[PDB]
């Protein structure tokens, strides 16, 4: 089976450089060009460039050209990308590619490699009760996961018993260079004087664990 | 440089019907076009090639067609797995540019407004010198919402920040969170904290609000 293994993840610091690695198998390693593909969160593929294994031909995309630095070991059929003076803008999903036998496709990629440039250090969330001061048919609780780095935090309800009309949404990025997230769940009204409600919020980089129960 | 104008940006549509995505090269790249589709959180993967070759495994409801320089995806009877987003890219000459994307998402038959619901900031989080009200859209449709924060009737801006869900798979909806940051001195200076809500499911724009001390 092709196959080409990439690391999950990288957090790095501004002003540094990061090598992202690519592990090709299962074909001849000297075959097939290697390109490199970026992806901003939440945003389109942007196309840095492609080398050719077996000889070490390069071509960059001038956007990136001293930006991304394009090698690799023959040897230990891997592709490497470093990626140098990292900023903000460079923390994105970064997905190696192999050619196809029409030269002309991506019929293979790696799956990503996320970068995330940032100078804040590791911090477990606060985590405060969400409940509406308040006839209506459902009711809402929540916790807002506030102030951590990095992600990402898992949060569950009930210890996992309640996934029904649970929302956690995506994270986003303060000013702090902290995180911040909501999660909540929408319940029947007549359960609120039966059933308690508890979000468990763990944030592995921390070694935090968040029990905390709201009270409609 | 060859770069490639994809449309449209998004597209919704529902099981059963057909769409076209379109890419314009910005000079001739002969045949030289692929297709991508990406899930949410996944590596993108082909669907065609030489513009108009379906690659392994692709179902024959998708297509693909040259006329020049443009280029154009057809998908015929879409069923669930097809919504996500859609990416062109060219091979003639360096750089191998993508187009911008397309983003398909399912249209729900009906239109399904916000359920609304404002939280006070805590006790605990306003010990701390900050004081951060949510205001959550649940389970609406379609995306297009506008939340407006007002305070003691005053429009507020640039101290909020929205979040949104990924459309859920089962029911077609979104939910979506916006949420109000300010400083304890801030907060205090005021009493009325409300999200107004405008949605096509709402005749009329809905309030919730909370004075400030009574919960």
């Known amino acids: 089976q092709v196959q080409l293994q990439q690391p999950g993840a990288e957090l790095v610091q501004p002003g540094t450089s990061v090598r992202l690695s690519c592990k090709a198998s299962?074909?001849?390693?000297?075959?097939?060009?290697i390109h490199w593909v970026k992806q901003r969160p939440g945003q389109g593929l942007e196309w840095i460039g492609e080398?050719?294994?077996?000889?070490?031909?390069?071509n960059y995309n001038e956007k990136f050209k001293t930006k991304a630095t394009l090698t690799v070991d023959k040897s230990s059929s891997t592709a490497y990308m470093q990626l140098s003076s990292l900023t903000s803008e460079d923390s994105a999903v970064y997905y190696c590619?192999?050619?196809?036998?029409?030269?002309?496709?991506?019929?293979?990629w790696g799956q990503g490699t996320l970068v995330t440039v940032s100078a804040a250090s590791t911090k477990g969330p606060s985590v405060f009760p969400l409940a509406p001061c308040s006839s209506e048919s459902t009711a809402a609780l929540g916790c807002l996961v506030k102030d951590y780095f990095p992600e990402p935090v898992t949060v569950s309800w009930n210890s996992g018993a309640l996934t029904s009309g649970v929302h956690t949404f995506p994270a986003v990025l303060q000013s702090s260079g902290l995180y911040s997230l909501s999660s909540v769940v929408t319940v029947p009204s007549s359960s609120l004087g039966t059933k308690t409600y508890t979000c468990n919020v763990d944030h592995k980089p921390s070694n935090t664990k968040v029990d905390k129960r709201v009270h409609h | 440089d060859i770069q490639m104008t994809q449309s449209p940006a998004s597209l919704s549509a529902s099981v059963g019907e057909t769409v076209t995505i379109t890419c314009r090269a910005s000079?001739?790249?002969?045949?030289?076009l692929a297709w991508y589709q990406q899930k949410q959180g996944k590596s993108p993967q082909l669907l065609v090639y030489?513009?108009?070759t379906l690659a392994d495994g692709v179902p024959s409801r998708f297509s693909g067609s040259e006329s020049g320089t443009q280029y154009s995806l057809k998908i015929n009877s879409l069923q669930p797995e097809d919504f996500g987003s859609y990416y062109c890219?060219?091979?003639?000459?360096?750089?191998?540019?993508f187009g911008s994307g397309t983003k398909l998402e399912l249209k729900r038959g009906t239109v399904a407004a916000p359920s609304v619901f404002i939280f006070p900031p805590s006790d605990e989080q306003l010990k701390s010198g900050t004081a951060s009200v949510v205001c959550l859209l649940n389970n609406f449709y379609p995306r297009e919402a506008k939340v407006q924060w007002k305070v003691d009737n005053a429009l507020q801006s640039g101290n909020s920040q929205e979040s949104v869900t990924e459309q859920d798979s089962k029911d077609s909806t979104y939910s979506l969170s916006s949420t109000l940051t300010l400083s304890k001195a801030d907060y205090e200076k005021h009493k009325v904290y409300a999200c107004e809500v405008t949605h096509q499911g709402l005749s009329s724009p809905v309030t919730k609000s909370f004075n400030r001390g009574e919960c």
């Open positions: 890219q060219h091979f003639w000459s360096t750089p191998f540019t």
């Open positions: 000079g001739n790249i002969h045949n030289y």
């Open positions: 299962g074909y001849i390693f000297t075959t097939y060009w």
């Open positions: 590619t192999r050619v196809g036998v029409m030269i002309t496709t991506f019929p293979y």
């Open positions: 080398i050719n294994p077996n000889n070490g031909r390069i």
């Open positions: 030489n513009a108009k």
